Design a binder for this molecule. Sequence first.
Ligand SMILES: Cc1ncc(C[n+]2c([C@H](C)O)sc(CCOP(=O)(O)OP(=O)(O)O)c2C)c(N)n1
Ligand SMILES: Cc1ncc(C[n+]2c([C@H](C)O)sc(CCOP(=O)(O)OP(=O)(O)O)c2C)c(N)n1
Ligand SMILES: [Ca+2]
Ligand SMILES: [Ca+2]
Ligand SMILES: [Mg+2]
Ligand SMILES: [Mg+2]
Lengths: 803, 812
Amino acid sequence: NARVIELIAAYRNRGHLMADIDPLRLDNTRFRLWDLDREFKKKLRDILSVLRDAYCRHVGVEYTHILEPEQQRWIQERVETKHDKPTVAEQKYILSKLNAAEAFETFLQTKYVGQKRFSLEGAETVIPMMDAVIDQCAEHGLDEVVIAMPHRGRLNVLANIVGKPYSQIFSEFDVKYHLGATGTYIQMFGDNDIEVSLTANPSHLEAVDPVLEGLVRAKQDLLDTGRFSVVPLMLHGDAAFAGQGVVAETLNLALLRGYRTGGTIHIVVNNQIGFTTAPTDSRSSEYCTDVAKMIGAPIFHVNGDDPEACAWVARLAVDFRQAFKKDVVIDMLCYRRRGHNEGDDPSMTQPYMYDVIDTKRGSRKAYTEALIGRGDISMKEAEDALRDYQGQLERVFNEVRELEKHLATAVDKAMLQRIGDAHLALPEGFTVHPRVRPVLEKRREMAYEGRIDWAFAELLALGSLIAEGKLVRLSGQDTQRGTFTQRHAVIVDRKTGEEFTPLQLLATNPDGTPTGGKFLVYNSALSEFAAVGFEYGYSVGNPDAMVLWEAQFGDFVNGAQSIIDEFISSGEAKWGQLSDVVLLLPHGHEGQGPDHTSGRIERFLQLWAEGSMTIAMPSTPANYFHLLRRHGKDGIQRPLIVFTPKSMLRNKAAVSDIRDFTESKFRSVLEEPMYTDGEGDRNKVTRLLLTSGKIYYELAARKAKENREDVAIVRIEQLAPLPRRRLAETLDRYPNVKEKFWVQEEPANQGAWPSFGLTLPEILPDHFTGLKRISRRAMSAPSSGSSKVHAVEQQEILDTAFG
Amino acid sequence: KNARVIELIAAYRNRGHLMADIDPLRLDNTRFRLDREFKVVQRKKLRDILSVLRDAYCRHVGVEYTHILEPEQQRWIQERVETKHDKPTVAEQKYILSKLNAAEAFETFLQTKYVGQKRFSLEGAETVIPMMDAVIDQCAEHGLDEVVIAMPHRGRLNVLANIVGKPYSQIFSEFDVKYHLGATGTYIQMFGDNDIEVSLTANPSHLEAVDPVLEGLVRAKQDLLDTGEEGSDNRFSVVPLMLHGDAAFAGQGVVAETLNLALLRGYRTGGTIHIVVNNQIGFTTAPTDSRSSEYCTDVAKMIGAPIFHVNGDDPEACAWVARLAVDFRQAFKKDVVIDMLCYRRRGHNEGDDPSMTQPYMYDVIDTKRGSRKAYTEALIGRGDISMKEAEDALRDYQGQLERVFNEVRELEKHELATAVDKAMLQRIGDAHLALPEGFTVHPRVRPVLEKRREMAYEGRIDWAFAELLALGSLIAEGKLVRLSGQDTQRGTFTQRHAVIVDRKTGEEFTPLQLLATNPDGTPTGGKFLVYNSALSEFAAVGFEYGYSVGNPDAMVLWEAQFGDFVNGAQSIIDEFISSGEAKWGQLSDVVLLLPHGHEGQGPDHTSGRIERFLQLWAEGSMTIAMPSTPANYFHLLRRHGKDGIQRPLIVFTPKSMLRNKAAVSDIRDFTESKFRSVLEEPMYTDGEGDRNKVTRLLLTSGKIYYELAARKAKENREDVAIVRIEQLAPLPRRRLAETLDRYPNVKEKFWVQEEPANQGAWPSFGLTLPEILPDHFTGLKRISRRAMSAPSSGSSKVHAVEQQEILDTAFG
Ligand SMILES: Cc1ncc(C[n+]2c([C@H](C)O)sc(CCOP(=O)(O)OP(=O)(O)O)c2C)c(N)n1
Ligand SMILES: Cc1ncc(C[n+]2c([C@H](C)O)sc(CCOP(=O)(O)OP(=O)(O)O)c2C)c(N)n1
Ligand SMILES: [Ca+2]
Ligand SMILES: [Ca+2]
Ligand SMILES: [Mg+2]
Ligand SMILES: [Mg+2]
């Protein structure tokens, strides 16, 4: 009886190593008491039969790694029971899905050339599997299923899952393998319907994974679900799932209050190959899905030649996700019938795999034959299924044949005061930390008396948008408090730890009615790639939301370079996909080293093309306030890249008056206040210094010290698109200028000079011919490691500018 | 009856760690909420079985091992953890105490002497010093050669003084970059007669980015010692010791990517010892906002690594677990993870009052005495040391505190031809046909082998063979050549065949490996290491960079599938490759091969982003090239391997140009030439072309030369000359000036490129060329694709119209 308990556990824990999951059976070595009629606390023979049928057939179940005992028991109870065999109607429906999938693959490989790399041949069982996921989500009465996938079988998914007509898919035939889509799934045997959408993606495998999560979360927030009535269905390749780090980063978001989507259904199209590379060179684990153990997700390894087991596992996966709001991974073992592309004979690199693959008949033929052998379908019914295949193959050829034949951002002072007062409108019994208390009181003072600092200006911009009814999502590393202890968007009760969000009071009107707005502010995980991916995705999911991601320091945003390059900077031109995502990048030379100095302005300026992004480096709190309000209210979906301050947050010269918020607008170009408001004479100016950011204050302090009336400092607040007209009109007001200099803190090969030094004399030749540069010398790093070297270099720039 | 006992044993083994007293702060208040003999074959009283299970799984060590698929590994851990362990000797306890004394004294000095050092404080986590000491001592006990450490900034200088053994005079000299520099030392056993080398690798502030770099460096050192995967012995005598933070370990994707390399034939280092300094905080962020798993180390389950969660206030358990981790790694050549639960005594940096965001954690922390005082007190309670001995431990603490204050005070008072012979070419050609007895060549690979023998003897050498001629000749000269990347053995474009596969057995054959043996039969000292990489960019590039640091005499090449995917490794490019030399004095000779070219395959199969590498470049940091001929690529690789200078090389390599019949080279280009940074048209250097007829000069780089040359030939345009810039960085100023001076009647000059106006070489050349050579490039104009937000159009129809528009503009 003790040997039985240890045997039951052996099947539950390790039974999946004996499971018949590989349709190619490449591993020969894989499968290599007599008192069975004795009753145990059920007869041993009946215990072993249940254990073999549940754990050693076409499904390999991995679940004993799960720490929650209720989750282990849930799987156990559903897997260790005598399952009701599918009805002939359900079997015929699965067969019709295989018929449609294989007829689409036959057409693709016959009608067009160069389509072999998109081939789903050897993996057509993923179509009835995805169909069962979506149908089971419809059965749960859910609202939408959003899909992210690589290029393999994407057009088959468009036709047989999303339900896109052939006329739309094969219109002016590629970019079609990277575009988004929307459709409606209607249940076959049920009375429910569900929305099905496919998100756009680059060729960069797995990069879309966090983008899907953000998009689904934005949709869930709009529907007020999380319920979690919007389901992410994420498809993968076996080599990419095990090798791409973004997979682990996206899994790590699955249960976070700021990023959870109530569980993702993962489908790995495990064709046991990655171009020419064997699994043994692609991963250090038994399974390509072993990374999912990181969050204790249940994993089901299923034989891709058994579409009934695949459909059953898909439905069980949806039920688990609904019950525990956690990720489920389906590892579908299949094969890639043809080579990776046109110039590939896969027996050059994988002779053994492809000698076995050459003897394989399709999943459709195998399933049709297995249904005859089992006596589930008659010869007429098998013949009718073959008619259905031919008819489906004819329809796509025929339908395609017919296709071929044919605003003010200023707020009222009462708005500033309301946001100010909100910082003191504390809940009953709330204990503020003694060091947070002066920050709340100073904000009430600033709101009524002026000298508004950068940190408060940001909250005035965000707070006024929430008051106007906008959803504001703000996140990043330690973003609630702020890296530089300046934000305090969330304050923590000194005795209970209860969080209080002052800006959330602006979601309610003075009369007590909701504005429709909301403030969602989170501390992110220590991720850049997945967090930026998520935020980009969130802005796509809800175009009406104000979405801001904040880097700890701009220097760490290179960890999210694939998102910047493949989605943010180029998604609009490539896919017509629009994003209003904001990236806040703390930037500035202060002597803290090459990883706490630059958000790499030069790289964002290099990526920029007409109307793709807005790139700014504001120097005043009011200009930042108007930049965020213009972004949220301009009705245009364009990413905004902001180079934000660090020490300039506390510079007492970098403060703004209430009138700058109430009676002004965003200024792309800024002159010195002595010329616009003071008694300064523009006609005395012979040298013009053009700059951006905090170095203005150091240049202005030096000018004041030596009383240099012959020098003027002009700031370019909007770096991209270049404010050509505002720039020209500003410089025209200084007629006696004999020399012009672009002054920057960044090395010569960095900052704005590489692009401005080439663009400014071309766009404005009567103004910038002969433009010279004052900067740090060109460097292989964003700065020196020494704060002593930094300090000498900073002084050398100021001395050169006034020499 | 005994079924409730078998179920109890399994429950403690599987889930005991969930009840183990691992948190020294005890923040979770919900966490912790007989005399009959049983068969276990041995007969033990139920009380004795339960006491063994409680001590093993529910004390100060939480053991996670039942997830391991190998039964022998599960049994090994079980046998060592479920035994009545011999308590450490008073001498061993006093030695652990002396390590805590030294660690805490270093920390107290660091906060008192200098300002702005709070962010690198190890207070609340000093137990990592006797833990690291036990790792290194246990590696010395196994007679290993070296322990190579990678870590973030927290406790770095303490590790330098108390682990690496660097003197204070060296540590606080010209006192920051010191928290990022590499170091080397010798660890000498206290209680033994063994010694071991201890080194610390350089790293940026980018947490976890150094993880694959450490692996690459260790692997290079193992290959040099002929230990491990490419060695005669299975000792893997160089041990990676990788330190982490709890928030970074769970959130950074490079962790999973590096763990995925642990057992790969091309990347394994025989197991890494991981130490997570789990201070249960990440700046102001709580674990519940940093991970979706019970533990920060749950990612390590991915490779079935054993995980030990240990209480940082128990340095005995920490030392014991460290020694067990080294023994497991030696027995199974697999990763071990130590999750050391501790706390961060101070705020994250100066000014930070941590009770603002974590009031509860920091009210508990304020009541906590140090790990040192805790261990001194716990030894008194156990009766292991007397009151006098406890007072001497406090005097050893004061003496250590005085020594560092005094030592630093005293410090302040005092302060080649690349051409080969035709016989070399022929030998590499013949090697492609020198097949092992019984080997079956796939019928489609056989002509490639026969064509390479014909190329070596008769010329018209293509790009793919030229690469193997450079690599093969270096191996023949005694150089180690490491080449890897996605499908690099065969080649993405089916052009390489560095490894060929037996049609019947699947056995691999490497033709270039025959060149590691001289014609007499003696070894050359060279070797060819060629691998297919995992589907990773960040970890694979990190690894290859690290490998070139570990063996500066090796030729290390990493090949991107397409240059477009190298942005996945941007942190390595930015933080190590382009800038490691200027920041840390750390040198790398790593080569990046990036398939590049506009051919209508879309924005992710077109560009390796030349403009970004050119933007990163600064005098003497990297070499950036886009060769147009096979012989020039051959001489570029040979120059790089033989220059005696450690500097990264970035090569933009071809795709369709691999099979362009005009892009072939003669034997004389390999045997009687050198690398040419600037190339003229052969009609001027070898033909009957007249340079004086030229009025328009087109400056270009790469495959567009052939299209421009074909158009010139078609219209017989004697008035137009095409000059190629093969070396993009550093700009070949002298060669470029001398070349253009040979065309006196030139009235207009154009930089012609395939890439959009905001991409390619134009953003830097358009600004630098008129400045570096004003008498030659004043008035230089651009012919290119329009500026774009992506590297190209998604349409091959649009690409084709744009390609023709460039050629027509160049000859209009
Ligand atoms: C991040 C990134 N790095 C590399 C590539 C290049 N790349 C591809 C092409 C050439 O673009 S396909 C491919 C192998 C895919 O292996 P898998 O996951 O087993 O799938 P499959 O069997 O369904 O194909 C790679 C490696 C990429 N797309 N993205
Ligand atoms: C990749 C990347 N993204 C962000 C940062 C910024 N950054 C740091 C500074 C300000 O640069 S420290 C830090 C928190 C570290 O948390 P941990 O791992 O729990 O450790 P600890 O408790 O031992 O400190 C972060 C998040 C970084 N360095 N690298
Ligand atoms: Ca907008
Ligand atoms: Ca070199
Ligand atoms: Mg695959
Ligand atoms: Mg930490």
